[PDB]
């Protein structure tokens, strides 16, 4: 950690006012509340008062202004929408890079309302795949379901949906959430899907999880698997979310130093990079 | 089908994963870099190509007694044709 | 200590190693990378900044653009490469 | 074919090093499938010779050894079919 660091180098020495001193003393309480948010922001702890965060998909169980401020700071500047946008563009890029390998005519950028990113009651479509040949589709299965049973039907247009969630301690199971929301949105009346067949990928940012339960076609399983792996490993927006969370938590994880100038490392001292020994 | 099983597959495996390879041309120059694109006629387009070769002072003292030095140059993006290219090898 | 031998590619590779310069059924190579119009790979912070600038619909200011251009020019100059003046002055 | 990417590289200032050591840097205006580089307002420096500036040049693709493009070349969008 970094005890007494803050955003202003903790501003310990100063001629600060008593109210400012109280605020500085309350900042570590903000860090503690942010740290323990997943286990105290759950509906088991507080009954009722389930209010979604502004322009964000996070629900605030119990009026905790400290946690409200901390989460607003973390998700400043429409970070949820940017994260969802980055994920959808990355998935589209991955699918385009492997277009002809799975008999996909093309991919489609569905017109998405901004709120869709943080719309939990209903949903919409994110990516549309168009085919030159018929796609035989299989019955719904989880992302980890190695064995899938094939459904006796085919399609031409295939939908992919991305749902981001902030799971608390009791509801951090991504697979159950993905399955329930797939079985809800597909059979919903305020959610319109281009085709009955498709895949819904749920991503838990609070715990860094991901799972898909929709209808799958052959060849899409490994592609989606490595796509999710690479998008959890190197997404820019997700990295920014992680960095903001780390800054809010003041988790200054220790890091190692560079290798010393030994008898097998001096050969890089005569390279094009200017190096100096002091 | 046959594009990933021929002799140019080492030129394709280093261009698919953007790996670093060194190509020695007919002018005794070794260009090391990541091949961005290839073709059937070995027209390799690479990025950040470091061309290392051997240079000589060419009788700087007047008696032709000098040692060759390892000269190196850097290019942002290069497009070397497959005519002058002699050999190529990926980095181990 | 290995010079660049004529008609040989192993010597340059050894010098670079010493200098430290180095279902349907398929295995889809899902590779995702961040690049710019200049072709250079972008740091995750830079990629996020570009994405946010494109999403917000407004780019950086003139001063920030000039600073970024100067930094890029300085980086290009540094990556392209006073001893003689110190030897002559001594 | 990589000749189609070089054919779409018109109105670009690039350099081309030949097999005889002559490097000609200029704005390429035309390129066929045989890498016939017709450029305008170029400057060619031969091997152990002084550089000479010409208003127009037509270098053949057979004697062209290598090329050199700047960092503002969109190779990710020009190498597509």
């Amino acid at each position: 950690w970094e005890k007494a660091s803050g955003f202003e180098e903790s501003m310990k020495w100063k001629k600060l006012t008593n109210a400012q001193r109280s605020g500085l003393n309350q900042i570590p309480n903000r860090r503690f509340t942010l740290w323990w948010s997943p286990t105290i922001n759950r509906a088991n702890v507080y009954v009722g008062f389930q209010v979604q965060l502004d322009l964000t998909g996070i629900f605030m169980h119990g009026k905790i202004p400290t946690l409200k401020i901390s989460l607003i700071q973390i998700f400043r500047a429409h970070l949820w929408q940017k994260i969802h946008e980055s994920i959808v563009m990355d998935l589209c890029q991955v699918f385009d890079q492997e277009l002809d390998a799975l008999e996909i005519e093309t991919v489609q950028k569905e017109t998405i309302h901004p709120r869709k990113s943080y719309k939990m009651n209903s949903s919409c479509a994110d990516i549309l795949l168009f085919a030159s040949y018929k796609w035989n589709v299989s019955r719904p299965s989880l992302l980890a379901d190695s064995k899938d049973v094939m459904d006796s039907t085919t399609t031409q247009k295939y939908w992919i949906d991305i749902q981001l969630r902030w799971g608390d301690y009791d509801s951090h199971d991504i697979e159950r959430y993905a399955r329930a929301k797939f079985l809800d949105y597909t059979t919903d009346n305020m959610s319109i899907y281009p085709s009955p067949t498709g895949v819904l990928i749920a991503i838990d940012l609070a715990y860094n999880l991901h799972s898909a339960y929709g209808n799958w076609f052959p060849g899409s399983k490994p592609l989606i698997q490595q796509a999710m792996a690479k998008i959890m490993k190197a997404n820019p927006a997700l990295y920014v979310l992680r960095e903001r969370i780390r800054k809010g938590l003041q988790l200054y994880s220790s890091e190692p130093t560079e290798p010393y100038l030994s008898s097998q490392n001096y050969g890089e001292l005569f390279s094009n990079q200017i190096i100096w020994f002091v | 089908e046959e594009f990933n099983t021929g002799p140019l597959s080492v030129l394709t495996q280093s261009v698919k994963n953007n790996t670093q390879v060194l190509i020695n041309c007919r002018n005794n120059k070794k260009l090391l870099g990541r091949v961005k694109a290839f073709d059937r006629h070995c027209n390799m387009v690479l990025e950040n190509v470091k061309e290392m070769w051997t240079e000589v002072p060419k009788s700087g003292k007047g008696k032709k007694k000098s040692k060759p030095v390892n000269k190196d140059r850097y290019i942002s993006k290069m497009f070397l044709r497959g005519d002058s290219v002699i050999v190529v090898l990926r980095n181990p | 200590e290995e010079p660049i031998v004529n008609r040989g590619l192993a010597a340059a590779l050894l010098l670079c190693q010493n200098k430290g310069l180095l279902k349907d059924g398929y295995k889809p190579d899902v590779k995702i990378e961040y690049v710019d119009e200049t072709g250079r790979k972008l740091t995750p912070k830079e990629a996020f900044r570009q994405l946010s600038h494109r999403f917000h619909g407004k780019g950086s200011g003139k001063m920030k653009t000039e600073r970024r251009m100067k930094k890029l020019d300085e980086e290009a100059l540094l990556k392209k490469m006073l001893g003689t003046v110190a030897l002559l002055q001594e | 074919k990589l000749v189609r990417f070089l054919m779409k590289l018109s109105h670009e200032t690039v350099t081309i090093e030949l097999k005889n050591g002559t490097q000609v840097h200029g704005t390429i205006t035309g390129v066929d499938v045989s890498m016939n580089t017709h450029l305008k307002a170029v400057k060619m420096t031969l091997k152990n010779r002084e550089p000479v500036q010409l208003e127009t040049l037509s270098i053949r693709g057979n004697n062209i050894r290598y090329f050199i493009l700047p960092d503002s070349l969109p190779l990710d969008t020009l190498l597509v079919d």
């Binding site: 980055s86 563009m89 890029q93 569905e110 017109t111 998405i112 | 994963n17 694109a37 | 999403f55 619909g57 | -």
Partner: peptide
């Protein structure tokens, strides 16, 4: 026997100050 390594443009569509329909442009 060729291979090309090209990145994904991933055109990033506008969110703020659009003045048109709410849904994103294609």
């Amino acid at each position: 026997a060729y291979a090309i390594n090209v990145s994904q443009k991933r055109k990033y569509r506008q969110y703020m100050n659009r003045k048109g329909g709410f849904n994103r442009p294609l």
